C-alpha cells in the first residue's frame, strides 16, 4: 500500500493550494504477522512504550465523548473510579 496525504485550504474558496505528499509506503504480509511484529494482542502489551501502539488504539477504537455536570456537589469521585474501580495506569 502506497500512502498519500492530501491537503486543501478552507480559508481560500479558490482551492488554490491542493498540495499532496506521498509520505511513504507500507509492505505487509502473513509472514510479517506470523511472528507478531505489528499486531497488538492484549494483556501482555500492558506496558505501552512504543507510542505507535497507543495511537493505533486512538484511531481504531470507537470514540464517545461526555460532559459531566454534578450541580449540587463538586466532582472528584472520577479520579477514584478511574484510578481505583477501573485501575487505570
Amino acid at each position: 500500500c502506497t500512502v498519500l496525504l492530501q491537503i486543501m485550504e478552507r480559508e481560500s474558496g479558490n482551492c488554490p493550494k491542493d498540495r499532496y505528499v506521498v509520505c511513504g509506503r507500507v509492505f505487509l504480509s502473513l509472514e510479517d504477522l506470523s511472528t507478531g511484529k505489528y499486531l497488538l494482542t492484549f494483556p501482555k502489551k500492558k506496558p505501552i512504550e512504543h507510542m505507535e501502539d497507543l495511537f493505533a488504539l486512538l484511531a481504531a477504537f470507537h470514540k464517545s465523548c461526555f460532559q459531566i455536570t454534578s450541580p449540587g456537589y463538586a466532582l472528584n469521585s472520577m479520579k477514584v473510579w478511574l484510578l481505583e474501580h477501573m485501575k487505570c495506569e
Binding site: G72, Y73, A74, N76, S77
Partner: protein, 160 residues
C-alpha cells in the same frame, strides 16, 4: 465504626475514635494520633458483595468523615490563631466529598486565613468564589467588611 465515629465526632470524643481506629488498623498505628491519617489508612473491607440492601456504606461514610473532621480541625486552628495549619485541612475540605454549601464555608474561611496572614488579594479571590458558588452570602460579605476595616477601605467596608 463509621456510625460510632459519626456519633463520637458529633460528641467530640476524638481520643476514643483514634483509639478505635488504632485497634481497627494495626496497633502499630498507635503513635499515629492524627485522625486524618487513620481515617485514610482505614480500608472499608469488601466491594460489599450481594447482601441485604443498605442506605449507606463505609466508603460513602468514610468519605463524609474525612471532609467533616478536616473541616472542624480547620476552623479550630484558624480561631486558635494558626492560619498556616488551617489551609492544609481547608483544602482537604474542598477535595473528597464537598457539597457546595460545605465549599462556600471552606472559602469564606480561607478568606479569613489569608486576611489573618496579611494576604488581602489571596483572601479576596476565595471570597469572590464563595459568592458565586454561594447560595449562602452573608458570611463572605462579612469577611469583606472585616477585610476593608483591616485595610481601612471605609466606603467599601460600609457597602459590603
Amino acid at each position: 465504626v463509621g456510625l460510632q465515629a459519626a456519633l463520637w465526632l458529633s460528641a467530640d470524643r476524638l481520643g476514643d475514635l483514634a483509639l478505635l481506629l488504632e485497634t481497627l488498623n494495626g496497633s502499630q498505628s498507635g503513635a499515629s494520633k492524627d485522625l486524618l491519617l487513620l481515617l485514610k489508612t482505614w480500608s472499608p473491607p469488601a466491594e460489599e458483595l450481594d447482601a441485604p440492601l443498605t442506605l449507606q456504606d463505609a466508603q460513602g461514610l468514610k468519605d463524609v468523615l474525612l471532609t467533616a473532621f478536616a473541616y472542624r480541625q480547620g476552623l479550630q486552628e484558624l480561631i486558635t490563631g494558626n492560619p498556616d495549619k488551617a489551609l492544609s485541612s481547608l483544602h482537604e475540605a474542598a477535595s473528597g466529598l464537598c457539597p457546595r454549601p460545605v465549599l462556600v464555608q471552606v472559602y469564606t474561611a480561607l478568606g479569613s486565613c489569608h486576611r489573618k496572614m496579611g494576604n488581602p488579594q489571596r483572601a479576596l479571590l476565595y471570597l469572590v468564589a464563595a459568592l458565586k458558588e454561594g447560595s449562602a452570602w452573608g458570611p463572605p460579605l462579612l469577611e469583606a467588611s472585616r477585610l476593608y476595616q483591616q485595610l481601612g477601605d471605609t466606603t467599601a467596608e460600609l457597602e459590603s
